[PDB]
A paper describes a structure:
The icosahedron-shaped NCLDVs have a roughly icosahedral outer capsid composed of hundreds of pseudo-hexameric capsomers in the icosahedral faces and one pentameric capsomer at each fivefold vertex. Each pentameric and pseudo-hexameric capsomer is composed of five copies of a penton protein and three copies of a major capsid protein (MCP), respectively. PBCV-1 has an outer capsid with a diameter of ~190 nm, an inner bilayer lipid membrane that encloses a 331-kbp genome, and a minor capsid shell in-between the outer capsid shell and the inner membrane.
The atomic model contains 7135 polypeptide chains from 30 different kinds of proteins, with 15 kinds of the proteins previously unresolved. These previously unresolved proteins include five variants of the MCP that are involved in composing five types of pseudo-hexameric capsomers, one kind of penton protein variant that composes one type of pentameric capsomer, and nine kinds of minor capsid proteins. Type I, type II, type III and type IV capsomers are homotrimers of the MCP, MCPv1, MCPv3 and MCPv5, respectively, while type V and type VI capsomers are heterotrimers, with type V capsomer composed of two MCPv1 and one MCPv2 subunits, and type VI capsomer composed of two MCPv3 and one MCPv4 subunits. Type I capsomers are present in all the icosahedral asymmetric units, while type II and type V capsomers are only present in the unique vertex, with type II capsomers located at position a, b and type V capsomer located at position d, respectively. Each pentameric capsomer in the eleven common vertices of the viral capsid (hereafter “type I pentameric capsomer”) is composed of five penton protein (P1) monomers, whereas the pentameric capsomer in the unique vertex (hereafter “type II pentameric capsomer”) is composed of five monomers of the penton protein variant (P1v1). However, the association between the type II pentameric capsomer and its neighboring capsomers is reinforced by loop 179–197 of insertion domain I and the C-terminal bridging helix of P1v1.
Author numbering:
A (entry chain aR): 196 to 292
B (entry chain bg): 244 to 437
C (entry chain bP): 4 to 145
D (entry chain bE): 3 to 399
E (entry chain bf): 50 to 195
F (entry chain aR): 50 to 146
G (entry chain cP): 6 to 40
H (entry chain cO): 7 to 36
Amino acid sequence: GAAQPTMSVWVDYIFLDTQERTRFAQLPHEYLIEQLQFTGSETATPSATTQASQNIRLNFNHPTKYLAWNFNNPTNYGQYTALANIPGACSGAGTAA
Amino acid sequence: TTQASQNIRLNFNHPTKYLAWNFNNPTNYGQYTALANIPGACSGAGTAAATVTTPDYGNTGTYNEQLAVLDSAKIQLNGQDRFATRKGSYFNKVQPYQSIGGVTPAGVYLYSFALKPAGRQPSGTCNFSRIDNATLSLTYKTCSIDATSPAAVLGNTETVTANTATLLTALNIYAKNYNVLRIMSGMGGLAYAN
Amino acid sequence: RLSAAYAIRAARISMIPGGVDGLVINYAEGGEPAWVQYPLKKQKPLPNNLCYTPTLEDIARKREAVIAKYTKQPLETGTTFTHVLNASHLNEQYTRVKKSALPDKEFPIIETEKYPEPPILWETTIGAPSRLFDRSDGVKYV
Amino acid sequence: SGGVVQLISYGAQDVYISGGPKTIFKSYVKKVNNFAIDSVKIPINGMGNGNPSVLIPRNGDLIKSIRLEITLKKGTGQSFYPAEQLISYLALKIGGNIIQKIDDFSNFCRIRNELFMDPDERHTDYRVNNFSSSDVVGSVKYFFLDLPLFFSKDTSVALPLIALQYHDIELDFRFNDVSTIQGVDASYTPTIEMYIDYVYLEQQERIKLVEKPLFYNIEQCNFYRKDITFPALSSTFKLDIPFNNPSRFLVWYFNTDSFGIYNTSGLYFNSNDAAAPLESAVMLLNGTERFKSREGMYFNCVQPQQALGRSPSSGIYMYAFGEDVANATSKGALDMSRVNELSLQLTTKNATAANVYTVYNPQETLASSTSTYKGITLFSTNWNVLQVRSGLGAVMF
Amino acid sequence: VGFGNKVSTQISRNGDLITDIVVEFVLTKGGNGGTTYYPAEELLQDVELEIGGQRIDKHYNDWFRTYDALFRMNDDRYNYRRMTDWVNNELVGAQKRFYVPLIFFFNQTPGLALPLIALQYHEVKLYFTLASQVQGVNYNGSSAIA
Amino acid sequence: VGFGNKVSTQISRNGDLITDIVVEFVLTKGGNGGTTYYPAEELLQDVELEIGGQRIDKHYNDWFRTYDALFRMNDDRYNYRRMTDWVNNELVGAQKR
Amino acid sequence: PNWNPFFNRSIIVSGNLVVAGGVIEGNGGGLTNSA
Amino acid sequence: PLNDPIMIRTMIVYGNLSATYFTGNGAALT
Amino acid sequence: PLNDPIMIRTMIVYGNLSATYFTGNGAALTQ
Amino acid sequence: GALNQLVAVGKQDAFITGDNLDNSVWRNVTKKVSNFAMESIENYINVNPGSTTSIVVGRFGDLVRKVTLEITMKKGSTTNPFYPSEQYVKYAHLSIGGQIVYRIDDFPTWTRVHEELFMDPDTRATNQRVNNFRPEDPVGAIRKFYLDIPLFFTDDASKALPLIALQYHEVKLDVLFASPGDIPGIDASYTPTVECYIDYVFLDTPEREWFARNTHMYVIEQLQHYNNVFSVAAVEQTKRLNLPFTMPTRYLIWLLKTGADGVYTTSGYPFENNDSYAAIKSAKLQFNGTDRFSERPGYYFTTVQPQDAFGRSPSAGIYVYSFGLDVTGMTSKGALNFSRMDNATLSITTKAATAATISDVYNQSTTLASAITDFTSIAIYAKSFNVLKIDYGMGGMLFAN
Amino acid sequence: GALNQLVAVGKQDAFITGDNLDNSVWRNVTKKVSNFAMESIENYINVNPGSTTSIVVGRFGDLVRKVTLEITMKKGSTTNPFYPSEQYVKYAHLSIGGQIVYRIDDFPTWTRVHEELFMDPDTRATNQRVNNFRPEDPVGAIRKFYLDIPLFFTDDASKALPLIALQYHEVKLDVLFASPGDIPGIDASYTPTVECYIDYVFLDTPEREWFARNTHMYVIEQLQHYNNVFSVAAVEQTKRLNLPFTMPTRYLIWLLKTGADGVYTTSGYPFENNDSYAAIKSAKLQFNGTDRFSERPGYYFTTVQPQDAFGRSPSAGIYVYSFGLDVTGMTSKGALNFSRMDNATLSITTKAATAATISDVYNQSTTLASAITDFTSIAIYAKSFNVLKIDYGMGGMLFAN
């Protein structure tokens, strides 16, 4: 019985005065702007006795400000860490359930 | 079991204001709709003596779409549709609403080429002297409802009607034309004839 | 297998069309010099006949002329008033014309729009692949 | 010395048929201007509302093909070409002006594909429109229906979208409720998503492509249906042909109340002409006969065997006006704007007993015909000209 | 499209001018005769006209009812009732195709027809607000009709 | 509009410059308190910007979570979650914009 | 029309043969059909 | 191909049949 | 050579079927 | 996306990218052909009492491309017939101006070869649909079959008989129907009705005048037939068969038959792809005592040569070897001139006729079913080149044979 | 009758009809080619150690167009072997002048893909008749198999190896045959007999002399091969596969195999067309960190990409993406230059191993039978362009890689 979402996009528009509108409309412009580069990959995460190594090949271009990364359990949006029987770390944590 | 289609070939000429048509039971003048055991529609209607084969004549005309026999129609000119398919309820209500401004009873249909077909000043036309062929494509309702049961006649969907609609065996398509009457030296006649 | 000594006799007895001229014929018995060809006659009139009928582009032109004629002119005039009074008028015009003479050219919606701002070439770009600059693949080993 | 002998075995007989500069072992090449192709996933408007349509976004210079991805499930019903039967209508319009209109879509697609597709494309068509019988009930798979649009027949008549700068291209189409299919599998809202294949050209081709006017000699599809009450006796139907544009072939058949069934057999793919409804047909031009009436089997297999090579299932009948109906080049056509009267006379077969193997005469068909048949349909594929000038595209006639 | 939803449409430039626009609905009556009162007009609540994104005006649910009761007259008003309601004592389960003509400045007379041929740089569209509760179709008073 | 569907919006040039875009989603939960985690954020899993037929940028489900988890800070990030999650132990049937 | 109608002769099967409906024939075979 | 041996609604065979296993109801000779 | 058969997997037929004689291991249902 | 493919380019692309001229696959370079009409004019056929009937092609058009020979017959037995329309026809001789120019001898044999060699699955299956009728229909059912006669001019419209250019004489073909009651096995004492429908092309005056008046020379194919007795024994016997053929040929086909039915293998059935039912072990061609190639196995001629020549391999019993690299198109690409070589020979080695119950106890590679001893003859077909000259209203062959 | 359509014309017709110039359907123009002969010449194999076989192509003619590898084997067991003629071959490396110019690595895999992807029914059925021994024949039967080597010059005669133009160095093919008992699974330990037959074209003197002396640049295809170890699990795994390719390619193929047999699916049998037995969920092909297209389902790549390009679609487990729009003709129509895009990566997302059987518990669209955990590798093939320059009797590659 789950419902579909309702959605719409709200855009904040900026209206300029007469004089600068001419400048923006007629003159050439260049903007120095940001992009995101992303491809997914998979880890080799061992259970016991091993600390695995993995060399992941990177496919990036242009002047990069930073590289950030995370690990997830694909079944739960945002599960960055392991689940455990401690407060806030799993369902029912702290109880026999 | 089916909503039949029927291609009615038109034999009209000249610039016209409009095409109008009805589905008539030839034995009963003005019977353009199905007859059913609902108030005012049949002889004895509402009582055990009701019969759905004889209309309550003085109230032959009705405003009940469920007794109409036309489900949808389109006019096709030289093999190409002139407008997208509209339901029978459009031609009975919507077209005369914006074109005439009056109320037309169920079973009488109008499509106009004219902005003001009720007026005498020309308001647009369609010249059927230069169109090679035109067809009025009709889709009928499935006439599966037992006319004697008002529970079904007054409670069903727009795509079905009463079994008595099958008695509407005659189709009457009319075209409202233009011509010019010329008068000269005591004699006259039409400017155009086809 | 002819020796070219029999090139004409063969052409005659077998009723081969025209003459041997312009045809290639085998010669004697060996080193088959297959290049031996009899020159074709240029004084070779075509059969004289009246097999031609009006060409199709001329018919097409006539049919278009007919379409133009009846666009403006009537098909038949009910010339019932000829010497009647002064009524050169009152002769009904008959206008339904057979299909073959009707136009089938549709409205020139391309030419009537007259957009105030004429077309511009819709160029797009993903920029230059600058990682490939000063890296020609046309350089050869020497 | 086999090849040596074959070369020594020479003479005038060889000079007439071979020789000269032309050498197949010349090892020559042809080149084309560079291009690149990708598939852009685009949304469909109005899918759950009423009549959906798409506007083609400017993600490239030419449009070469559009196909629709439909995902749905198996539910024991055993249906044929679901991807086609979920769609009832498809049209393409340039600037609001319809230039290709497909009515009775599901049967059009099946028939056009069976007539023109060869064993490899037709078999794959099956594979991407149907289910795999081996699958578990409830399984879900992707369907990829290639839309039979006039510009997808041949790379070279791809829509010059860059050249249509002022009005856009809209594809309107309609869907059947999922439950409509006689063998419907499930009350499962199918996922329906469209992909459009865009072509990128080189810049110097974009310049001359927009600057000069374009004329494309293209196909148009059309449709006429006339419902009948099918006789027990071999009477003749008078089928008018209210069409205008020049055509290379026309296809007609007697339809039933289901999808894809064009004969009385009740098997789905019917190769057996015994269940075929048509005894014979003759086409008339200006009220006069073009040929002696030929039997339904002539139009069912002999004519397409010559014109296309491929024979449809029993019940589909075709007549050609040219020499090579599958070609991208016009190879003969009849001009329906100039012939005053066009009609096709169809004489149906006489009713006989069920258990169809039993039919004895070419003139006999099943008595089941009266119940199953609802009508006669006609398709005619016509030539017209798509003109593009200064940013505006339209059909000339 | 549905009860309480907001939808919109942009007018494809199929022709040169726009005049009558008619909104149609397919709807099933959830009650018996006399339970509904212009259910097609209640369902179609607000209509907002934009030309190129600039608002020209907005019609509201209650206005439609006022205009119909205030300016539309004689045969024209009854015909309208036929276009928006059940007028023949129809019973529960009946389904009908309803039409609700719009009344913007270009919807009543051709002399004010909207000139799309001259507005190629201002796309024209309509925003619609549909009712969450329609009397006799999904609610009877405030009671939901299952 | 629906779960698993792709939709787009054409940007009407109502103004001169365009800047902040905020997408509104209306969701009704079927779970209990603490059973959701940025449900409006995972809802938009692949959003991308084109200008004139070509891609400028492309963002993903976990990029939004990674970027907010990494680059957003303060009361500002709590407010962000207020906009994308249920933060008051809301019960089955609750609906939020 | 190919493979959807019936066969001429001599079907060799490397696996099982599965039917829903009925099979119209009889002969020696596996462990049964011989008593 | 001859690698999806799945049929719907019809079958008859003239010659002999050879197989490993089998299933279905029984109306068989001997 | 296109119809004449070599079955490499399980053949399935959803309907009445016939043949002259058979030859193979038997585990049918009814007999 | 895809635009990356066009920016990341360099010299390597110079060998695949074209010039700025219109050699691209778009901006179609439209080709156009003149307007024409076609009509199927029925031909009257004179009575055919198990004898020759002449079909005369009248001047009811400019070109004729194909001849459709329609036969209506009824099944008289429970045996399923094998191409009964082709078995009923025994031969067809085509003559121009009274001179025989094309012959199909032992007609059902050549057309079954032709269908397997030239027709694709859809064309092949369709040709069967209009010539065979094999559902389990009752005895006495009547069906019409539509048999196209494979004449030299039917394959490509451009070689259609240039009849308008032959003003002084007609063109006819003599078709003989030997018997319904001999080989089909489905006779019901019923004389089949035979009708012939042929097409005509009608050209407009510009080409019609040019074509009817100018001299023409068409390169055409001719079919040559030879047969001999070909028995097989229980030992690996050989045969050395003379090949009495003339003119350049593109290929030759030879087959072994039980000329009692359309069966070329010991299986007793058509379309057998198992070489265990075919006799030829190896073969070579020889010209003037010198060998064209090392002996190749029988299976090589049934499954390998066909791949280069046709893109299609017949069933066993039909053996083909090609001289050209393309034998189905219109352009000649290699041929051997049988008019210059005086002694052409086909040398065949067979397998031993010692095997029985082939599915169980067949020997390995040197035997075949002993049923081969019921084979009687070998037929050899070849397609040769000739030239049809049309000049001043008369046509004929340049090379008489 | 038909003449009605010929005369009933107008402007709409005249626009699309042709003029009276020589481009009409008829008026057959005779086409000629130079005089040449084809011969099939036995080429004796000097190498039989049960290891790498070197087959040197003798200069027995002017051009070599096709290579046929003839292998004799016996049916080792009851189970029907699956292309035993091609499984016996492990690779074929073609070299010219000592330089390796074409590599067919993991040979049965490329030929099975080649057959299912690029060959039609008539040639697929033939290729099986001479490679895929599955009739119900007795165990121990001996058959001769005739496989082709799919080298760059065997698709069109115009690219035939111009051996006469290679006066100083020869052409040789290195074929390694896998031990008979390693993979086929159906072998009698009977050592296969291997013979090679290839054809030669003989040109007549004018062209033969010109051709041998005229330096010519041949634009040819090359086959590039990549493989790696690949495994799947009970989760929807994703992997980045490196693509170490150079030179413009028209398409790229990858397949997921259980490299024990010719099986690419969970079925465990030679062929399957049901995507539910294949373990690929979706894929995209990426270059330089930027995506040419969004992830499309595994089924999309098996059927839609090759159908749009050339009709045909392979069995499941075989996935194809085309860079151009025509990959089977000789003209290059679209290619991606792998020498200009530095980082080429194939991104594959698999289906989860969750089901026991497909017919009982197959999930909606992202799982299949756990049998997929027996997958061992993904092989990738691509066809690139290069130039074979034959100059002063020596040959080699113009572009070094």
